[PDB]
Design an enzyme around this catalytic site. Structure first.
Site, mmCIF file in Angstrom:
data_model
loop_
_atom_site.group_PDB
_atom_site.id
_atom_site.type_symbol
_atom_site.label_atom_id
_atom_site.label_comp_id
_atom_site.label_asym_id
_atom_site.label_seq_id
_atom_site.Cartn_x
_atom_site.Cartn_y
_atom_site.Cartn_z
ATOM 1 N N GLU B 12 0.581 -1.074 -0.254
ATOM 2 C CA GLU B 12 0.105 -0.100 -0.017
ATOM 3 C C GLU B 12 0.728 1.195 0.330
ATOM 4 O O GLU B 12 0.809 2.234 1.297
ATOM 5 C CB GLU B 12 -1.134 -0.108 0.799
ATOM 6 C CG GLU B 12 -2.588 -1.217 1.216
ATOM 7 C CD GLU B 12 -3.189 -0.755 0.181
ATOM 8 O OE1 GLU B 12 -3.626 -1.388 -0.368
ATOM 9 O OE2 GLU B 12 -3.559 0.567 0.178
ATOM 10 N N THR B 17 -0.318 1.095 -8.546
ATOM 11 C CA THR B 17 -0.254 2.455 -9.138
ATOM 12 C C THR B 17 0.850 3.679 -10.306
ATOM 13 O O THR B 17 0.619 4.063 -10.546
ATOM 14 C CB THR B 17 -0.708 4.162 -7.423
ATOM 15 O OG1 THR B 17 -0.938 2.658 -6.532
ATOM 16 C CG2 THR B 17 -1.378 4.319 -8.240
ATOM 17 N N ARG B 147 -7.739 -1.172 -7.568
ATOM 18 C CA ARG B 147 -6.874 -1.841 -6.566
ATOM 19 C C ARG B 147 -7.221 -3.286 -6.955
ATOM 20 O O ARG B 147 -8.032 -3.912 -6.669
ATOM 21 C CB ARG B 147 -6.872 -2.064 -5.419
ATOM 22 C CG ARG B 147 -7.773 -0.476 -4.394
ATOM 23 C CD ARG B 147 -7.183 0.250 -3.441
ATOM 24 N NE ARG B 147 -6.231 -0.585 -3.263
ATOM 25 C CZ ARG B 147 -6.719 -1.507 -1.285
ATOM 26 N NH1 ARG B 147 -7.901 -1.659 -1.078
ATOM 27 N NH2 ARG B 147 -6.127 -1.671 -1.209
ATOM 28 N N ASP B 169 7.588 -4.658 -11.082
ATOM 29 C CA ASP B 169 7.242 -4.334 -9.580
ATOM 30 C C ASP B 169 6.972 -6.004 -9.440
ATOM 31 O O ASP B 169 6.381 -7.199 -9.481
ATOM 32 C CB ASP B 169 5.470 -4.415 -9.243
ATOM 33 C CG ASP B 169 5.599 -4.073 -7.971
ATOM 34 O OD1 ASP B 169 5.937 -4.156 -6.591
ATOM 35 O OD2 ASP B 169 4.337 -3.224 -8.154
ATOM 36 N N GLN B 173 5.032 -12.000 -5.167
ATOM 37 C CA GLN B 173 5.139 -13.020 -5.873
ATOM 38 C C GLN B 173 5.430 -14.224 -5.533
ATOM 39 O O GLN B 173 7.131 -14.921 -6.314
ATOM 40 C CB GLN B 173 5.197 -12.838 -7.202
#
Ligand SMILES: Nc1nc2c(ncn2[C@@H]2O[C@H](COP(=O)(O)OP(=O)(O)O)[C@@H](O)[C@H]2O)c(=O)[nH]1
Lengths: 21, 319
Positions: B12, B17, B147, B169, B173
């Site tokens: 977050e 973004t 989101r 990013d 994962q």
């Protein structure tokens, strides 16, 4: 230790309040 | 002549973004086809937002202003599945608008530091009328605030200032470990994101330390890693808007008790930036490029990224 730290901390991104494709 | 950018930073913080922004600015942006696809997502995120607020009033024990609207809450959980296919029922829109206007619910929203509320919540809840139309197609901005749960590795690529940018990013994962590790290989610059507005968050049941300090420890690990001695470190102190508003009310002493400075936005931000930059333990041999971003502001991100690119080029002329 480093990669584990990264995975741990980067994943808390609130999984509720989110959706998939 | 290829450039590999890697986004790191806690959850977050703005990473996904920023990727989306990179699409909007250096790719063609989002086509109306895709914007259509994101409608369901928008409605969804809106719903989970208001729900989360409600559960929060539950745990914090805050009663509605008008106890009447409570029934809509009961109704909401049933009407919750009314988005999946499409079109939010005007009945549902009236549930949300009624609950969100309730000064008791608002009192819970203004205490979002005490629980885990999404940062895209307000954006949607205030713009409810615009999106509750049946002919609604989402603004690019509306898509920015979407989101999406990440499968594994996110990656976008684009061409800019006669350079090829591949941006990754790697967040969360836990699988495909080889492709995952390769994201950390041959990185030209790491872009570490920090959510400033997380300074006033209350220590949760599951943390050892304050959220900001978690981000700090993470940055300490990344910055002083022997692998990155030849990697540029870019620090995005993000969510500056929310930080500016919050700092008016919530003291920084909440997060840094030793802080003796004043509660001006400018002085506080400087103190945080100091706290992070001090973690560089190879101070002479490595310099940290710090920027203060608002990742939802496309103009801002475009500017900052331009500056970053300029620094990269200037480092190339050195070669
Ligand atoms: N208001 C505001 N919200 C932000 C800013 N930066 C990020 N956010 C919000 O943070 C939320 C999640 O950010 P995200 O990109 O998913 O961070 P990530 O989990 O690290 O990838 C989004 O809903 C954004 O609206 C900012 O500068 N201002």
């Amino acid at each position: 230790d480093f990669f584990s730290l990264i995975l741990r901390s980067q994943a808390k991104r609130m999984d509720e309040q989110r959706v998939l494709l | 002549k290829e450039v590999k950018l890697l986004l790191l930073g806690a959850g977050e913080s703005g990473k996904s973004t920023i990727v989306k922004q990179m699409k909007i600015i250096h790719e063609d942006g989002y086509s109306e086809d895709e914007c259509k696809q994101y409608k369901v997502v928008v409605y969804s995120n809106t719903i989970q937002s208001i729900i989360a607020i409600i559960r929060a009033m539950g745990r914090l024990k805050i009663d509605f202003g008008e106890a009447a609207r409570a029934d809509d809450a009961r109704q909401l959980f049933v009407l919750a599945g009314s988005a999946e296919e499409g079109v939010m029922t005007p009945e549902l829109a009236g549930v949300i608008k009624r609950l969100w206007r309730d000064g008791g619910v608002q009192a819970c929203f203004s205490r979002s530091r005490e629980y885990q509320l999404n940062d895209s919540a307000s954006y949607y809840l205030n713009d409810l009328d615009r999106i509750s139309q049946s002919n609604y197609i989402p603004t690019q901005q509306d898509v920015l605030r979407t989101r999406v749960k990440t499968t594994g590795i996110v990656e976008t690529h684009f061409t800019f200032k006669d350079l090829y940018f591949k941006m990754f990013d790697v967040g969360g994962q836990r699988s495909e470990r080889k492709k995952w590790i390769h994201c950390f290989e041959g990185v030209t610059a790491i872009i570490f994101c920090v959510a400033l507005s997380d300074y006033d968050l209350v220590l949760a049941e599951d943390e050892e330390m304050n959220r900001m300090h978690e981000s700090m420890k993470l940055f300490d690990s990344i910055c002083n890693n022997k692998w990155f001695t030849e990697t540029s470190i870019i620090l995005f102190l993000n969510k500056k808007d929310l930080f500016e508003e919050k700092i008016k009310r919530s003291p920084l002493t909440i997060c840094y008790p030793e802080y003796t400075g004043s509660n001006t936005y400018e002085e506080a931000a400087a103190y945080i930036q100091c706290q992070f930059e001090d973690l560089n333990r190879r101070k002479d041999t490595k310099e940290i490029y710090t920027h203060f971003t608002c990742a939802t502001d496309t103009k801002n991100v475009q500017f900052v990224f331009d500056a970053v690119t300029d620094v990269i080029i200037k480092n190339n002329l050195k070669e």
